[PDB]
Design a protein around this ligand. Structure first.
Ligand SMILES: CC(=O)N[C@@H]1[C@@H](O)[C@H](O)[C@@H](CO)O[C@H]1O
Ligand SMILES: CC(=O)N[C@@H]1[C@@H](O)[C@H](O)[C@@H](CO)O[C@H]1O
Ligand SMILES: CC(=O)N[C@@H]1[C@@H](O)[C@H](O)[C@@H](CO)O[C@H]1O
Ligand SMILES: *[C@@H]1O[C@H](CO)[C@@H](O)[C@H](O)[C@H]1NC(C)=O
Ligand SMILES: *[C@@H]1O[C@H](CO)[C@@H](O)[C@H](O)[C@H]1NC(C)=O
Ligand SMILES: *[C@@H]1O[C@H](CO)[C@@H](O)[C@H](O)[C@H]1NC(C)=O
Ligand SMILES: *[C@@H]1O[C@H](CO)[C@@H](O)[C@H](O)[C@H]1NC(C)=O
Ligand SMILES: *[C@@H]1O[C@H](CO)[C@@H](O)[C@H](O)[C@H]1NC(C)=O
Ligand SMILES: *[C@@H]1O[C@H](CO)[C@@H](O)[C@H](O)[C@H]1NC(C)=O
Ligand SMILES: *[C@@H]1O[C@H](CO)[C@@H](O)[C@H](O)[C@H]1NC(C)=O
Ligand SMILES: *[C@@H]1O[C@H](CO)[C@@H](O)[C@H](O)[C@H]1NC(C)=O
Ligand SMILES: *[C@@H]1O[C@H](CO)[C@@H](O)[C@H](O)[C@H]1NC(C)=O
Ligand SMILES: OC[C@H]1O[C@@H](O)[C@@H](O)[C@@H](O)[C@@H]1O
Ligand SMILES: OC[C@H]1O[C@@H](O)[C@@H](O)[C@@H](O)[C@@H]1O
Ligand SMILES: OC[C@H]1O[C@@H](O)[C@@H](O)[C@@H](O)[C@@H]1O
Lengths: 485, 485, 485
């Protein structure tokens, strides 16, 4: 009479295919997708403060477009700028539009403190029929269209010191009229000038008296410039004409605020990661939704699928063990022992090796990857305009980052899956050689992941081999007589 | 009488040295270079459309330099700009030259549609002796040098709507004369002005009446600007003077087109990857030729050599096996069995383990690397000018990319070679323990990668061990009597 | 009588914790920090030439601020710009300040060659009380404030050819006065002009007659521009007024020079790597001190600690061997043999496997990492100003690089530590199976990393097993009689 102890591992009929260093496509028992390929479709408004620019750009809310009067003094961690947005005030252009938009977005607040500028000998609060405030004519609420008073426009020259402890942002402008008649009617001088200076900075702009396309009934423009006044510094606005003055300063801050062009609707939910396609869950280490991200988002990768083997290698199917096949009928644990003796066939898992493999497998990826990279303000990555050098450089930087992180994700998945598979085979072989070392001369490796044990082995003794208390010398005198004789 | 079965692997006298994680320099049987270090020397003109700018820059072909009249309406996937190139027309400078060059290169076409601009009260088709068209005086063929008609130069003011479904590109200019006499002779106003506007954009340029170096007999210049008109938009050209008008618009496209500064000649061959040094083969995953690439090119790496072990570890040299030495006299396969019995010494490979190792080794690198990264338009990376901030940023981005990809290539080669070596030793040891499991108690591991088999083993039985049909129990009663007695 | 040979490895009570692919926190015998987290606090002035800008910016030393007269013609490999720096001359602003600063820093020399500009009909060597040279009024020493001579300011128009073999750098300026009275008093024309041109370049600047904050007693400014003249080219300075001419040219070079904002003091020591926090040792492959680097510096990584296992796995504690525990009482070598026989217990290391493991472990990281990346001039990474697009792009490039290199460092440490641990366990198991192959049938694996040897084994024979000369057949007839009987 002899016994048989086969060592084995769990298998599943539902084998998931993964990628490794050594195999293009290998079948494992379980796998987790690391690439968030689909979004919720909606921008969840927590924990980040989401400001919906329903029909307003950021610059139109800054300047005070009347339909953006509902954005006076609004703060945000993300400004969602809709493609539906339009302007309904005096036609304007921002030289260096993207820089102003970016610094106002990172500022995270349109907190406008009005200041007592003493514009003397000049008519304030100029207006236009291209911005009906409500009824009648108006203008940007955060600007002051100055025009001649009587028969002259003096050389305006005012100062404003920054005695506070923060950067002030002064949004000013220059009026480019259409005709010299319009110039000399608004500003008596034949060609104006707007200088705005600090102790360390300068901008001087000569207006551009020339006609141009009719936008809301005007062949004139406002060229919007800005000036950042540091603490202790001082602003000076000098002007010979064509000045669109500021009424005050925008309280600059520095923080996690940003801006995002999106058309997805906001919804009352919770999500750390926001994309133009909506909020996504940050549970996975990579994504494929969009490269434009805000918050604790995963990394963007070109790959649409990257399956990490969070389980072992699958070999789905005389009680032969692991050298031949894996066991489908073992859910008690990962690695285990089947056994055949006179007291009846049976099975029992080994939670030691199972729990070792799970302890190594449960926390694999989170010890070579980041928490979830919190990126709040980044470069622009979707361009509507054609600009050339700086746009191509931004595109190239982002494409470089994307290709590098895609390669890193591919190599990481391959390495971690190869290590998972070698680790699980290692635990199986370690259990095998452990049981070999318990059965010094009382057993023989049959070659199918199984020990033929040459003494009568009741289920108590099979359990003794399973749990490690098996003393070989009790049965040695019998097993040698059954092996070599 | 006893037999002897040694297991072994192929070896070669021509051992190639490679790098791993664990060994600085280890000898393997075969190795493939992954870094394309040398070029063909010629730019192959397929599958990409290569336009040879024989003596023409891209901007001189855009504007219509007479010796670039052969580039009217030419399209390309790559514009090869020769260092031999020169200008032979009115001296000019492009403020933001690189941006115009880049967007015209990505445009991939100089398709110029002439438009009926109504320049009234003004003499069109001005010319110069600094561009002989052929005989006589001429000008850029895609521009229109306007000058006074009679005794006055009116305030030119024309419009052109973009009712089409593509971006129009209007290349216009401003004439900077040398003297006020030249100004008031060409343009009656003492100081001109050129405004070019759309519903959302602006450029207004006051000319610069001042002398400057004589280039082709002139101390005057053309400052070339551009304006991109989106669909539905409208262009307006206003001017008080010094206008170099456009005759039409360049049909902007968006695609795989680009530009490359090179002196290599074009040749009728096929190659996906183009560099300034010539076309190179894209068979290898990395390169060292140049960082400037067009097409399906490998990645640039600082390394000049990176040998991937596409073979196993080399140990070149009583029929002792793999624990001692490798076999030079085995080409039948990778892993194999030598044997010594009474019926004569012999040898035979094992195609199972050989083909396993080759199946794992043939497709290693192409399951963690990209297809071949198709990069068409990228930043400029070789600068002739000194520009400071943007140039240093482009250089830093490219050097960052190069160092990162060089490190990735080094780590990848080390990892893949270490995995190759461990994999081949693993297949050898797996075959060894397989043969151990076939020879349960009939054999003994001699310690030189060899089993001394303690029964008479004819060549049929050695083949039985080789192919897996060896049943131990037939010879057990004899082998135990020969081992322990 | 029987003997016992246990194989084992060294252990230490001082176990250092490290990170791997398979274990979050595993205990090893020795570990090296790869992240230089602390600096010396001082900038060591060798081998790089360090120029201490004690109270001088680079532009103030370029132009010739009087308290920077001690920096005439100074050369550097690194210009240390102090936060204590101030200007004490005519108030000025540099449009494109950062580009001029960067190209003058990479130039690595303020070598100023004076040229014989023939400014005729005009008063040279203008001065101001905002730069007392020493006593009296003066100006920038490398500029020439031109003013009217008598009752007229002619149209200045001079040329200067670059007949040399290097780029010349001409630093010129434009005077923006406060009042039209000041303009027409200094420069008779009501609105000046400064054109500076070459055969391929242009800059024309109309001054800005407007008041502005009083800096050192003046509401006027100098707008500093530059012009780089290549070999064979020619400079032409034309001016209707408001010209701040150059007295000569700065000899541009190209090399390892750079600039760094720092407050750390210089000290006479030796160090290749300089940061604003001081010089640091470049012995480690990564750092956490600062991302701003000059010289042969390590790579910046967000991690503050990254311990590389330069030793094996620690298992600190009947002479049981390596399967159970590691040995604390073995310093002779890494892997070794303990033994118990009738001639007394004893111990002896195996320098073969020890030296194999050390040869593999001593040079691990330096065969997948770089020498130490020499980066001399890079982008600016700490910004005092808010600028928007280009600043955000520089920040994003550097943050991308930092996150990528941090991930690479983490993955590299995990991989190299996992390979160290698997390599050391591999050498231990290889020694174990070597000793198994020496003791073919004379021994039995007890299961605690130990062979019970079934013949009397004097210390000479234990040494025979240790050094490899052990012939099994001498003791086989006795060991079989002691094992199976
Ligand atoms: C491009 C454009 O708008 N051109 C305008 C047109 O809209 C308008 O009907 C007309 C009024 O004088 O002037 C012109
Ligand atoms: C730099 C330059 O070309 N200067 C020109 C020179 O070429 C020419 O001989 C002369 C003609 O008046 O005017 C001056
Ligand atoms: C901002 C600033 O400096 N403003 C100046 C002030 O310093 C000076 O006291 C005064 C002299 O007229 O002119 C004003
Ligand atoms: C808007 O902002 C500032 C912030 O202090 C405040 O003083 C001002 O009165 C506010 N006005 C409105 C209408 O919110
Ligand atoms: C302009 O006002 C500023 C206020 O800072 C002052 O410096 C300067 O004296 C004034 N100039 C004139 C002409 O009023
Ligand atoms: C996300 O939106 C971008 C831009 O609209 C689009 O290119 C991409 O295909 C979208 N992806 C998903 C998963 O919706
Ligand atoms: C050049 O381009 C446009 C493209 O349609 C065409 O209308 C025009 O007549 C072409 N002229 C020549 C000479 O190729
Ligand atoms: C200039 O022409 C444009 C054409 O779009 C038009 O808007 C404007 O009325 C014209 N102005 C004058 C003064 O002719
Ligand atoms: C390729 O060309 C570049 C620029 O001419 C040169 O720096 C490099 O050494 C060349 N490489 C080869 C392999 O020809
Ligand atoms: C400074 O630089 C140039 C370099 O040749 C030299 O000719 C000049 O005389 C030097 N002057 C002083 C004071 O160092
Ligand atoms: C100005 O001087 C330059 C010197 O290069 C010359 O080209 C030009 O003839 C001069 N013009 C006048 C009006 O003197
Ligand atoms: C180095 O200096 C920078 C800037 O002053 C600071 O942010 C950083 O904490 C410093 N690090 C060390 C290690 O001193
Ligand atoms: O775009 C339509 C508008 O164009 C302009 C003027 O002719 C307006 O009267 C007209 O309503
Ligand atoms: O550069 C040479 C040219 O220079 C200028 C004029 O003096 C021309 O007559 C002359 O041919
Ligand atoms: O900032 C102080 C200075 O301001 C200005 C003038 O009023 C000076 O007289 C004064 O000393």
């Amino acid at each position: 009479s002899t016994a048989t102890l086969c060592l084995g591992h769990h298998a599943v009929p539902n084998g998931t295919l993964v990628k490794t260093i050594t195999d293009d496509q290998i079948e494992v028992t379980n796998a987790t997708e690391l690439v968030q390929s689909s979004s919720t479709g909606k921008i969840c408004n927590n924990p980040h403060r989401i400001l919906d620019g329903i029909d307003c750009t950021l610059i139109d809310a800054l300047l005070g477009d009347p339909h953006c009067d509902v954005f006076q003094n609004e703060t945000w961690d993300l400004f969602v700028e809709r493609s539906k947005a339009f302007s309904n005030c005096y036609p304007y252009d921002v030289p260096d539009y993207a820089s102003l938009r970016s610094l106002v977005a990172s500022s995270g607040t349109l907190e406008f403190i009005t200041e007592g500028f003493t514009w003397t000998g000049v008519t304030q609060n100029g207006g236009s029929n291209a911005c009906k405030r409500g009824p009648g004519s108006g203008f940007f609420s955060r600007l002051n269209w100055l025009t001649k008073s009587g028969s002259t426009y003096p050389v305006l020259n005012v100062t404003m010191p920054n005695n506070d402890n923060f950067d002030k942002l002064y949004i000013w402008g220059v009026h480019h009229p259409s005709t010299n008649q319009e110039q000399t009617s608004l500003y008596v001088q034949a060609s104006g000038r707007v200088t705005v200076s600090t102790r360390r900075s300068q901008q001087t702009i000569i207006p551009n008296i020339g006609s141009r396309p009719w936008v809301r009934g005007l062949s004139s423009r406002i060229s919007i410039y800005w000036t950042i006044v540091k603490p202790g510094d001082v602003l000076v606005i000098n002007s010979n004409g064509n000045l669109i003055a500021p009424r005050g300063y925008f309280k600059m801050r520095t923080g996690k605020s940003s801006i995002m062009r999106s058309d997805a609707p906001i919804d009352t939910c919770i999500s750390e990661c926001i994309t133009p396609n909506g909020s996504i869950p940050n549970d996975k280490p990579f994504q494929n939704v969009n490269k434009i991200t805000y918050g604790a988002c995963p990394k963007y990768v070109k790959q649409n699928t990257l399956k990490l083997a969070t389980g072992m290698r699958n070999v789905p199917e005389a009680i032969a063990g692991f050298i031949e096949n894996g066991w489908e009928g073992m859910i008690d644990g990962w690695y285990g022992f089947r056994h055949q003796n006179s007291e009846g066939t049976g099975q029992a898992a080994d939670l030691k090796s199972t729990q070792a493999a799970i302890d190594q497998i449960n926390g694999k990826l989170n010890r070579v990857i980041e928490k979830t990279n919190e990126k709040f303000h980044q470069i622009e990555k979707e361009f509507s305009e054609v600009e050339g050098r700086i746009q191509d450089l931004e595109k190239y930087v982002e494409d470089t980052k994307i290709d590098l992180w895609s390669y890193n994700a591919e190599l990481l998945v391959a390495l971690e899956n190869q290590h998972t598979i070698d680790l699980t085979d290692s635990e199986m072989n370690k259990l095998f050689e452990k049981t070999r070392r318990q059965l010094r001369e009382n057993a023989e490796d049959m070659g199918n992941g199984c020990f033929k044990i040459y003494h009568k082995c009741d289920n108590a003794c099979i359990e003794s081999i399973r749990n490690g208390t098996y003393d070989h010398d009790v049965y040695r005198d019998e097993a040698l007589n059954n092996r070599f004789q």
